[PDB]
């Protein structure tokens, strides 16, 4: 069945980014909203917002592309898995593309990326690498 | 030539069954 | 595959077959060296090869190659045997070191003169 909507969301992102889709729609969960917030303020997508779905909430996000048809995301990868959870301390955080990409980190301070985790001093769950 | 891989197995199985039929009696039933 | 599968049954390495036997962790081992004779190699490389049936001090029996040319080995020479397998012969997997108790060094050896057993000169 439907396991790990985090990976479902990022796989929807991959498939539509590879298909050059302007926008994606999916179910809304607070974790998805915060992941889309991270993706925004790290600059991998354009605006996202929410519909009044028939049930629940519906999360739509827009995919930004360069002036020509170049992907603004070069890929992405779920790292924390429901079959294998991966945790990282603040001193041994993952380095995505040596730094040119980022990793979504879940911490007691909420969801926040590699730079905030390193210079704020707490590590924890590593949901995914976007780059 | 993937059928050759089947023919080797066929020959080995055929010889084993032939040996069992040579010994379905006290030749092998005692043992 | 499905990491739960790995935790239920872990990755187990393939059995590494013992490359050398009859010596049981011994770099060399001596033998009474019965039945010296000469045998033929496989379908190519038609020649005649000097081999010896060695009763090793592991209380085993193996076939060994006599390297070099010439040997004084007949039936009961106390030989020292080490590894090394010849490609031509099927059952040869060991080699008597030349220059041991009752294996003299090969005569007229002036090149490489440590294998095959040889003092320099007089």
């Amino acid at each position: 069945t439907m396991t790990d909507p985090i990976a479902d969301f990022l796989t929807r992102l991959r498939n539509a980014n590879s298909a050059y889709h302007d926008e994606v729609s999916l179910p809304h969960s607070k974790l998805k909203a915060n992941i889309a917030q991270i993706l925004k303020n790290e600059g991998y997508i354009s605006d996202f917002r929410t519909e009044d779905a028939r049930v629940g909430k519906s999360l739509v996000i827009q995919l930004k592309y360069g002036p020509s048809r170049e992907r603004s995301i070069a890929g992405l990868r779920r790292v924390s898995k429901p079959g294998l959870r991966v945790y990282a301390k603040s001193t041994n955080l993952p380095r995505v593309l040596g730094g040119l990409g980022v990793a979504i980190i879940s911490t007691s301070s909420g969801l926040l990326t590699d730079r905030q985790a390193a210079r704020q001093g707490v590590g924890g769950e590593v949901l995914a690498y976007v780059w | 030539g993937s059928v050759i891989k089947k023919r080797r197995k066929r020959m080995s199985k055929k010889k084993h069954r032939k040996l069992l039929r040579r010994t379905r009696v006290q030749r092998r039933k005692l043992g | 595959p499905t990491i739960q599968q790995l935790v239920r049954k872990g990755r187990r390495d393939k059995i590494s077959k013992v490359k050398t036997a009859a010596l049981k962790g011994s770099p060399q081992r001596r033998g009474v060296c019965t039945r010296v004779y000469t045998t033929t190699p496989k379908k190519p490389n038609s020649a005649l090869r000097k081999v010896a049936r060695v009763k090793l001090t592991s209380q085993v029996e193996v076939t060994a190659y006599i390297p070099g040319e010439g040997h004084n080995l007949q039936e009961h020479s106390m030989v020292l045997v080490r590894g090394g397998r010849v490609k031509d012969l099927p059952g040869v997997r060991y080699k008597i070191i030349r220059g041991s108790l009752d294996t003299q060094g090969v005569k007229n050896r002036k090149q490489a003169r440590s294998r095959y057993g040889a003092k320099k000169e007089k």
Partner: protein, 169 residues
């Protein structure tokens, strides 16, 4: 003053009624030694003719390799037909470390500092195809920043930040 290097010379054959018709394939890599590298396959009845054809069609298959001063910007893994080549940037001291087929391509590209590892097929041609694919996958901080909309300093790590200007003063 412009580097060529041939990696593999392989004698192919075509079978006809009379017998076997032989030919030579000459995989060559042409490079400037700073950032310009191209790979040419090249085929001809004669070994130097195949060398020349490979050089001539490698010099028309060029692509820029993004470096930062002897090492690549970030680590990648190129996947060829069946070749897999993994590249990891190296500290400014330890030189090129690569296998026979990869080493030529990155030396012609002009990297001085790289960790290369062939994990997939061992065929030289597919190895160089995989390495080239990895160099395509390579990206620059200054265009990743344009890709993401954020400036240089908040996309590229401070290490490579301060390591860039140490070349050009």
């Amino acid at each position: 003053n412009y580097l060529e290097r041939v990696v593999a010379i392989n004698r192919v054959s075509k079978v006809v009624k009379g017998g076997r018709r032989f030919s030579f394939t000459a995989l060559v890599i042409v490079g400037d030694g700073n950032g310009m590298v191209g790979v040419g396959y090249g085929k001809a009845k004669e070994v130097p003719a195949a060398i020349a054809k490979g050089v001539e069609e490698a010099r028309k298959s060029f692509f820029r390799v993004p470096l930062i001063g002897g090492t690549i910007t970030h680590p990648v893994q190129g996947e060829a037909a069946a070749g897999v080549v993994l590249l990891r940037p190296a500290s400014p001291g330890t030189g090129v470390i690569a296998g026979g087929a990869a080493r030529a391509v990155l030396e012609c590209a002009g990297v001085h500092d790289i960790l290369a590892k062939s994990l997939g097929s061992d065929n030289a041609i597919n190895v160089v195809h995989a390495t080239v694919a990895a160099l395509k996958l390579l990206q620059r901080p200054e265009e990743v920043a344009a890709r993401r909309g954020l400036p240089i300093e908040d996309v590229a790590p401070a290490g490579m930040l301060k390591a860039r200007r140490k070349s050009e003063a």
